[PDB]
Amino acid sequence: AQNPNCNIMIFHPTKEEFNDFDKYIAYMESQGAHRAGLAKIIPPKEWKARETYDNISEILIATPLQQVASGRAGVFTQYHKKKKAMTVGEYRHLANSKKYQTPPHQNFEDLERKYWKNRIYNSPIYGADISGSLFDENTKQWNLGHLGTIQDLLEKECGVVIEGVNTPYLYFGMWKTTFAWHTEDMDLYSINYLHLGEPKTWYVVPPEHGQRLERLARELFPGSSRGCGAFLRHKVALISPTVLKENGIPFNRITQEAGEFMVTFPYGYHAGFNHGFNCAEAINFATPRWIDYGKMASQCSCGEARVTFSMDAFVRILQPERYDLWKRGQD
Ligand SMILES: O=C(O)CNC(=O)C(=O)O
Numbered sequence: 011a012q013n014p015n016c017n018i019m020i021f022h023p024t025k026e027e028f029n030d031f032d033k034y035i036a037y038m039e040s041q042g043a044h045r046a047g048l049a050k051i052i053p054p055k056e057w058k059a060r061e062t063y064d065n066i067s068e069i070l071i072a073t074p075l076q077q078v079a080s081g082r083a084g085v086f087t088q089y090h091k092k093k094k095a096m097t098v099g100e101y102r103h104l105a106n107s108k109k110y111q112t113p114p115h116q117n118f119e120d121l122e123r124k125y126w127k128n129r130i131y132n133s134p135i136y137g138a139d140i141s142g143s144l145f146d147e148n149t150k151q152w153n154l155g156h157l158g159t160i161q162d163l164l165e166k167e168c169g170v171v172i173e174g175v176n177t178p179y180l181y182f183g184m185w186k187t188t189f190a191w192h193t194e195d196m197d198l199y200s201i202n203y204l205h206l207g208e209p210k211t212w213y214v215v216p217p218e219h220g221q222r223l224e225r226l227a228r229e230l231f232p233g234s235s236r237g238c239g240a241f242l243r244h245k246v247a248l249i250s251p252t253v254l255k256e257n258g259i260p261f262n263r264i265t266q267e268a269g270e271f272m273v274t275f276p277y278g279y280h281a282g283f284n285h286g287f288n289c290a291e292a293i294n295f296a297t298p299r300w301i302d303y304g305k306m307a308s309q310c311s312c313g314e315a316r317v318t319f320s321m322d323a324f325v326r327i328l329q330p331e332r333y334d335l336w337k338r339g340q341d
Pocket residue numbers: 181188189200201202274280290292293
């Protein structure tokens with residue numbers, strides 16, 4: 011078995027190898043990359059997502075989210091308070107303000123220490139989940155607005171034609187902005203490109219050990235657990251590396267820098283934080299190997315997780331028994 015310790019793998023494709031997205035994913039899996047839950051892909055040196063970022067300041071963040079924490083430094087939840095709209099230029103200025111800017115630090119490890127020590131005492135503002143793309147239409151390789159769609163993958167593998175669309179999302183981050191422990195909707199893959207700015211640190215649990223994380227989460231968030239049988243779908247809970255180590259949960263960590271892709275694999279729990287002002291683009295995708303994960307994916311039926319139009323069809327076709335109760339949650 012390749013990669014039996016489930017380490018995060020890093021790939022350096024040539025420009026020739028960067029032509030065929032599906033083939034390269036299947037290559038990475040042949041080397042065991044999926045066992046980690048997360049892989050890094052460094053694009054060929056000749057490749058660019060677009061010519062410059064000089065003209066992005068007029069993008070609108072319609073509903074910036076202030077991430078308010080509750081709990082203890084290593085075990086907390088966050089709630090998202092909606093703020094008034096602002097442009098990316100306004101948000102960048104905010105991120106660079108004395109109140110919100112990255113503190114002085116020695117290296118990524120010192121900054122990671124400061125994040126876990128101090129996150130809960132601040133409420134950074136995240137411009138998340140903004141439909142759109144920053145890839146130039148002329149970028150033909152690994153353009154996250156030009157991928158094969160999940161609906162087309164399901165049709166190719168299973169023969170069934172379904173409604174729905176699959177488009178990317180932009181994330182504008184600042185120091186301390188945080189993504190809670192989660193897997194993707196329907197345990198899909200994700201791909202994330204860091205277009206610009208400061209780094210993003212990731213934590214990941216190997217898919218084969220995801221249920222260990224879930225059992226710990228039920229112990230650490232016991233009222234949430236009684237409220238919903240899949241409450242990590244709410245995307246609100248954080249658990250630090252120190253706490254994961256104290257409880258024997260297998261995980262890995264890596265820092266993504268501007269210009270790099272990350273891929274999360276089906277049922278790979280991940281969480282993380284931004285080091286400073288940045289912009290990422292991400293989208294879900296599927297391969298043939300995903301189908302079985304989609305059939306087995308947990309679902310939130312308490313009503314909190316409230317997800318896309320396109321997930322309807324996935325549930326209806328892959329999980330017809332759950333269909334009924336899950337749609338009661340979504341209506
Ligand atoms: O970048 C973020 O805030 C969150 N991104 C992801 O969870 C992802 O790409 O799967």
